[PDB]
């Protein structure tokens, strides 16, 4: 790998702030904040909104009523 041309690349642990699940990868992004890690090391911490451990499609668990047929809607609206 040629020297002095590529972007700075350092290890970094990122966390899905919704669930707190964290794990380590590499990125060109850094943070003014850092955290420790297993194996006994410290890495910059990158906060993330969503990951595979929280995204509805990944988890399979839905969050709505899956719509309602119009016949059922009619019967519910008019108590029939």
């Amino acid at each position: 790998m040629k020297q002095d041309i590529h972007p700075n690349y350092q290890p970094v642990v990122f966390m899905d702030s919704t669930t707190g699940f964290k794990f380590l990868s590499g990125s060109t992004k850094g943070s003014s904040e850092t955290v420790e890690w297993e194996d006994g090391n410290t890495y910059p911490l990158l906060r993330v909104e969503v990951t595979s451990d929280s995204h509805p499609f990944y988890t399979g668990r839905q969050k709505f009523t899956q719509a309602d047929g119009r016949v059922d809607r009619f019967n519910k609206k008019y108590g029939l």
Binding site: G69, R70, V71, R73, F74, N75, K77, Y78, G79
Partner: protein
């Protein structure tokens, strides 16, 4: 819209007409002038010939159409561009 307490509306004669045909494996066209009649669940599978002002346009009532008035499927004006 129409107050909930009143419940849905359908002309009684039309409701009787559909009731008479509820027990029909092969249903027959139901001719009506009652555009104001709502589409009830029992209407599904029927074909209602709604008067549009000059002729009875047949409308096949699928279950997706419930909640709508009959006249919503019988346009009264014909416009083909200028």
């Amino acid at each position: 819209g129409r107050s909930l307490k009143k419940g849905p509306f359908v002309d009684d004669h039309l409701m009787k007409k559909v009731e008479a045909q509820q027990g029909a494996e092969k249903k027959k066209v139901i001719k009506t002038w009652s555009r104001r009649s709502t589409i009830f669940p029992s209407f599904v599978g029927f074909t209602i010939a709604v008067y549009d002002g000059r002729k009875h346009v047949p409308v096949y009532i699928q279950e997706d159409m419930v909640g709508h008035k009959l006249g919503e499927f019988a346009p009264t004006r014909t416009y083909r561009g200028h």
